[PDB]
Amino acid sequence: NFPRTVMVNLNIHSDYYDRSTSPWNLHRNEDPERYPSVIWEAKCRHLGCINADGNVDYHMNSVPIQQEILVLRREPPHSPNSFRLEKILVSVGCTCVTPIVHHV
Amino acid sequence: PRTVMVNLNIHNRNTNTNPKRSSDYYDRSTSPWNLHRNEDPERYPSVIWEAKCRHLGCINADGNVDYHMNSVPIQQEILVLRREPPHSPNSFRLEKILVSVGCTCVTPI
Amino acid sequence: LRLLDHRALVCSQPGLNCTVKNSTCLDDSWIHPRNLTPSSPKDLQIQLHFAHTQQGDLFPVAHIEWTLQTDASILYLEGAELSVLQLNTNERLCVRFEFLSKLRHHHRRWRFTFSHFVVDPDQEYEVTVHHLPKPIPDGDPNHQSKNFLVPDCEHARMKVTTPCMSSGSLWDPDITVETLEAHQLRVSFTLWNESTHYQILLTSFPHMENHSCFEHMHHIPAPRPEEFHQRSDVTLTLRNLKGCCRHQVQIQPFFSSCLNDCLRHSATVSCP
Ligand SMILES: *[C@@H]1O[C@H](CO[C@@H]2O[C@@H](C)[C@@H](O)[C@@H](O)[C@@H]2O)[C@@H](O[C@@H]2O[C@H](CO)[C@@H](O[C@H]3O[C@H](CO)[C@@H](O)[C@H](O[C@H]4O[C@H](CO)[C@@H](O)[C@H](O)[C@@H]4O)[C@@H]3O)[C@H](O)[C@H]2NC(C)=O)[C@H](O)[C@H]1NC(C)=O
Numbered sequence A: 001n002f003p004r005t006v007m008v009n010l011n012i013h014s015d016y017y018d019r020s021t022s023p024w025n026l027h028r029n030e031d032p033e034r035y036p037s038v039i040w041e042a043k044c045r046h047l048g049c050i051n052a053d054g055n056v057d058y059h060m061n062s063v064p065i066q067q068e069i070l071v072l073r074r075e076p077p078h079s080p081n082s083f084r085l086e087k088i089l090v091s092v093g094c095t096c097v098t099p100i101v102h103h104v
Numbered sequence B: 001p002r003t004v005m006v007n008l009n010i011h012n013r014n015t016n017t018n019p020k021r022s023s024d025y026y027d028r029s030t031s032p033w034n035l036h037r038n039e040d041p042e043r044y045p046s047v048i049w050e051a052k053c054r055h056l057g058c059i060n061a062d063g064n065v066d067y068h069m070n071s072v073p074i075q076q077e078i079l080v081l082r083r084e085p086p087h088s089p090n091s092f093r094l095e096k097i098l099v100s101v102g103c104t105c106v107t108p109i
Numbered sequence C: 001l002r003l004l005d006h007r008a009l010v011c012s013q014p015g016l017n018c019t020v021k022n023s024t025c026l027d028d029s030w031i032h033p034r035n036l037t038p039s040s041p042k043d044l045q046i047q048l049h050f051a052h053t054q055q056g057d058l059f060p061v062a063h064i065e066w067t068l069q070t071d072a073s074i075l076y077l078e079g080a081e082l083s084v085l086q087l088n089t090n091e092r093l094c095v096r097f098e099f100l101s102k103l104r105h106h107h108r109r110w111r112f113t114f115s116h117f118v119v120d121p122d123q124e125y126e127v128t129v130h131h132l133p134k135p136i137p138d139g140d141p142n143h144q145s146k147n148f149l150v151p152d153c154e155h156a157r158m159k160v161t162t163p164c165m166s167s168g169s170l171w172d173p174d175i176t177v178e179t180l181e182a183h184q185l186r187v188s189f190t191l192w193n194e195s196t197h198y199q200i201l202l203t204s205f206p207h208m209e210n211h212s213c214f215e216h217m218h219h220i221p222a223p224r225p226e227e228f229h230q231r232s233d234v235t236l237t238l239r240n241l242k243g244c245c246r247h248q249v250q251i252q253p254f255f256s257s258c259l260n261d262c263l264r265h266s267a268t269v270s271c272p
């Protein structure tokens, strides 16, 4: 500080979630005050993974993959030109993992 | 708009970490992966860690790779701030980039 | 990621006046480059330390330590940006050392430390110290990064840490699988001090064959605070099959700290 706001050239320019052994559901996150305005959040379908038969495998763990990402938020609100940079944690998808087991 | 005003006083909205979470899954996954550092001194964020799947197939119970299944990457289109030359203004560009964030095991069609 | 305390952090030492300010990992020297940049840090080392919060809980902390290079660029060294990057999520956390005074001589080698970055078990980070101002475009690096790999809760010192304990690192279920009269199995275990549910997975196999001839999942609803540390035995009936004798029974906790991904506990019953 003093704050350094800058001039940015806006040079901007579909599956698996159903087919995975750890399938997930995508949830629409809309915000007109944000860019990207619409962003999809994954939430794992089950606690276990899925076996060949389609039933939930209780011996495996359906677990989320998250990421810290950048977004632009209109500052002041509704501004067409000015925005502020924001960090946000987001779930992108799910993976199937082998659980940690201790034997006796 | 072609050109915009961006305040780089990054507002952190990633604060609700209250209940405990996270572990390293790249080795424990049925679609295991390897980490690759993607650095660029001229862009924010400078370094991004991407995943590259280990196999075309997935690791079975016995631990051997099953090819009747597929390790596939979980890609994510991400915003990046790139700092320009200097020469050819503007000073910064805002770009969309494809990134592999992890792997999942899918049933093929 | 987090710092362990929001206490008045100090970076000052004899010969040098500095305050540790926090930073957005996007430094003002990257937005606005300067022609005269300092040289790179030297001998970056990150060690696993353990610390207590002003409250009482113990956390695994990253101990970052580096030294300065002997060149005259020291005069132009304004401070340093300390950065932790978790690799799984691409989460970044920064703190900045702001030199309020100017370092002129090298008479005695300048060494720095920072031990406030809270780190998690079985995690890999990328810790980096970036001398400030950062370089000009296409300039030589002036920073040092090292990957830090934190051990799992099995580690001697680690299991006595707050995140580990909360995921039941010190929980000992005295699992006792008992073979009973007429195709019945009684499985007893002592539950933990958390109001989260549990599961029992019984998988039967033939003697020396890794194929399930019978499988059953049993639910244990979240217990009352009075029910904590008390025993919960459940009697489950097996499949009728002379041959399907090898029983593998495992308990799955669902502690807030780990949810589905908690450490499970297996026990096996034999045959003749
Ligand atoms: C959840 O449980 C854990 C572990 O539970 C303990 O072990 C199991 C097997 C059962 O036997 C339980 O009944 C036990 O509680 C809890 O962690 C333990 O907490 C106790 C009490 O806080 C700790 O015991 C002793 O710690 C220090 C060691 O230096 C002693 O000085 C303490 O004594 C003082 O405080 C007492 C209580 O205030 C008081 O009565 C005494 O007169 C004395 O002034 C204390 O006895 C133990 O060390 C902890 N375990 C570890 C390894 O840190 C945990 O607190 C529970 N959590 C929840 C949320 O319920």
Ligand SMILES: *[C@@H]1O[C@H](CO[C@@H]2O[C@@H](C)[C@@H](O)[C@@H](O)[C@@H]2O)[C@@H](O[C@@H]2O[C@H](CO)[C@@H](O)[C@H](O)[C@H]2NC(C)=O)[C@H](O)[C@H]1NC(C)=O
Binding pocket: C003, C005, C006, C007, C008, C009, C020, C021, C022, C095
């Ligand atoms: C960013 O920093 C402020 C200030 O905290 C301390 O002082 C700075 C000079 C620097 O040394 C920091 O690393 C220190 O941690 C943080 O604000 C504090 O927040 C807590 C509650 O979260 C509050 O009890 C304190 O009184 C606050 N201190 C002041 C002086 O405002 C702020 O949380 C830091 N941000 C993050 C996310 O770490």
Ligand SMILES: *[C@@H]1O[C@H](CO[C@@H]2O[C@@H](C)[C@@H](O)[C@@H](O)[C@@H]2O)[C@@H](O)[C@H](O)[C@H]1NC(C)=O
Binding pocket: C012, C017, C018, C100
């Ligand atoms: C580091 O620099 C600080 C700057 O001093 C400031 O100005 C004087 C006039 C006082 O009002 C002081 O409180 C201000 O902070 C000083 O604290 C001091 O010189 C140095 N601090 C230490 C701990 O050495």
